Each structure stands twice: as structure tokens, then as C-alpha cells.
Design a protein around this nucleic acid. Structure first.
Length: 92
DNA sequence: GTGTTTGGTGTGTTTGGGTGGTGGCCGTTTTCGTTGTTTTTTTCTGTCTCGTGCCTGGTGTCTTGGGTGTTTTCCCCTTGGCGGTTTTTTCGCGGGGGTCTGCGCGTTCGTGCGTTTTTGCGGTGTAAGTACTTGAGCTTTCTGTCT
């Protein structure tokens, strides 16, 4: 039962485009994409942590990594989204 | 332009097989209290970067000469392109065989974690003779007494 991001990418698609489906080949592309972005961000956060002699990866490390990797408006909106989500989550 | 006339998008009906939706369940996310620590916080020292100031002259830079090398034009000679025909092998489906990749079960020895030992690496705890000083001995005078 080798695990994947499929259910979520289909949930998000159904939210943004209720009448649009997804081929298996394109679904594979999305899984690869998610995995790749995950590894870019986590790796940058790891480097940041090591440089500053810290042992925990917190939201600050992730935010900075996002700012370093995502170009322009992609970064600005991603940061907004991430901040909104961690705000909503802490205040439950 | 007028004109034919090969290429390409729009239209319709038909097929199917591949995506979406649902049932079953199990394994992974969580709800909880406790531990232990990696933060964060404040307060310290005191490094290093910013700021200014003066003087020198290496460098920048404005400008005249000019010449050469880039831009365009004319001509060519040729080598890719488009087409027709023949070749052939890529590819498709089916069948057969075997290797080797993955699960599971058993373990042993290899590494992490610890107390401990240690070298490098680095901080700094004799006999003389002269000059000077000091302590013992006795003067003046002045102040009190006293006939």
C-alpha cells in the first residue's frame, strides 16, 4: 500500500474546479511536484537550522525557506497562506 | 485580383475502457499526562563598522584623428527540400520460460552510549676606610625664690 498525495490533490481540484477531472499521468505529475517542493523546502530549512546552531525546525525556518525559494508574488502569497493557517491553528 | 485545389477545422454518431464513486478495514494520526531540555530572556563586554578629515596622484574623461571593419549589394554556385517508388522492419498480439525481487523469519556482531584515559594546545609565576647619624656629658642664661 505505497503512500501518495492523490486524495488531497483531488480534494483541492474539486474545490477549485468542481467539474474538472484528472488523468492518471497528470496525477503522477502532481505527486512528483508535491514531493519535489517538499524536499526543496525541507532541505533549505535544514540548512538554515544548521547555520544558526538550532536543533528544532519551526515555522520561522519554513517561512524563510519559502522566501528564499519561491520567486516574487508566489512567495508573498505562500507566506500569507502559511501565516493564516498557523494563526487559525494555534487559536483553536 | 481571379482562380483552382490541397490542408485543415467543424460536425455528427459510435465505443469503450479508464476515472470516479462506494463498501470494508486496518494502521496511522491523534488525546492525554509526564520529562526533560532547547529554546527564549536579559544583562554583560567590548569589537568593529560607520563618519569624518587631509593629502597624493592613479585614474577618469573630454576631445581630435583617423582608419578599418561592419553593413549592404550583386552574383553564384550548390546542396537541402519536395515528390515518387520500393523496401523493410517496427510494432503489435500471443505464447512460453525463467530469473530475480520482495516477504518473512532468525541472529549476531557492529555501532551507539557511556565512563574513562589521554597529547595537544595554550596561560603565565670579605675586608678595609670615610661620611653621616645618634646618644652621653657639661656649659650659659633666665626665671623663681627668698633672705
Amino acid at each position: 500500500r505505497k503512500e501518495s498525495y492523490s486524495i488531497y490533490v483531488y480534494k483541492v481540484l474539486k474545490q477549485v474546479h468542481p467539474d474538472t477531472g484528472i488523468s492518471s499521468k497528470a496525477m503522477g505529475i502532481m505527486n512528483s511536484f508535491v514531493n519535489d517542493i517538499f524536499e526543496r523546502i525541507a532541505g533549505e530549512a535544514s540548512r538554515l537550522a544548521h547555520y544558526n546552531k538550532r536543533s528544532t525546525i519551526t515555522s520561522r525556518e519554513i517561512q524563510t525557506a519559502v522566501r528564499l525559494l519561491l520567486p516574487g508574488e508566489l512567495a508573498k502569497h505562500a507566506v500569507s497562506e502559511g501565516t493564516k493557517a498557523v494563526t487559525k491553528y494555534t487559536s483553536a
